[PDB]
Amino acid sequence: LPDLCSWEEAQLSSQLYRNKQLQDTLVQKEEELARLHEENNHLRQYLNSALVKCEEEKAKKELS
Amino acid sequence: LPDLCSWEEAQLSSQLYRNKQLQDTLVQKEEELARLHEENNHLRQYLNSALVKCEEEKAKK
């Protein structure tokens, strides 16, 4: 029992360490995701806004 | 001692399960990031192309 207990405790420490590393990576990923979602959406909006104005201009020009 | 051992065993089990969950979440997050990076690049490419064409249309005379 005491040799098993010491082995189990070491495995637990190693597991908690690996999980902490995963957890930290996951925080970094979530914020990278949030950044990209916001940038993609804004870029999308900007493109749509500019392209629409280009077409509005052609419409009112090409009427006479 | 015997109380600590059972607590540590139960924690090994919970933490193995936690590891799996974190691993599963991470593969899903990486897939999502890979797609958003692809989209971001395409959006920047499209933007560049639209700036050029916007500019060339200002061949205004």
Numbering used by the authors:
A (entry chain A): 69 to 132
B (entry chain B): 69 to 129
Publication passage describing the model:
Geminin coiled-coil domain-containing protein 1, GemC1, is a member of the Geminin superfamily. The three members of this family, Geminin, Idas and GemC1, all share a conserved coiled-coil domain. GemC1 has been identified as a Geminin homologue, and is also implicated in DNA replication but at a later stage than Geminin. GemC1 has been shown to mediate TopBP1- and Cdk2-dependent recruitment of Cdc45 onto replication origins, enabling pre-initiation complex formation and initiation of DNA replication.
To better understand this family of proteins, the crystal structure of a GemC1 coiled-coil domain variant engineered for better solubility was determined to 2.2 Å resolution. In particular, at the C-terminal end of the coiled coil, residues Leu119, Val120, Leu123, Ala127, Leu130 and Leu131 constitute a hydrophobic patch. We thus decided to mutate residues Leu123 and Leu130 to glutamates to increase the solubility. Our mutations yielded the construct tGemC1L123,130E, which allowed the expression of highly soluble protein (>2 mM). Residues 71–129 and 70–124 are in α-helical conformation in each chain. The two mutated leucine residues are indeed pointing to the solvent, as expected from our sequence analysis and in contrast to the other predictions discussed above. Based on our structural data, we conclude that the change of the hydrophobic solvent-exposed Leu123 and Leu130 to hydrophilic glutamate residues improved solubility without affecting the global structure. Analysis of the structure using the SOCKET software shows that the coiled-coil region extends from residues 73 to 115 and spans six heptads (technically speaking, one residue of a seventh heptad is present). Analysis of the coiled-coil parameters by the program CCCP shows that the GemC1 coiled coil has an ω0 angle of −4.1° per residue, suggesting a relatively tight left-handed superhelix compared with the Geminin homodimer (ω0 = −3.9° per residue) and Idas–Geminin (ω0 = −3.7° per residue). The superhelical radius (the distance from the superhelix axis to the helical axis of the chains) is longer in GemC1 at 5.1 Å compared with 4.7 Å for both Geminin and Idas–Geminin.
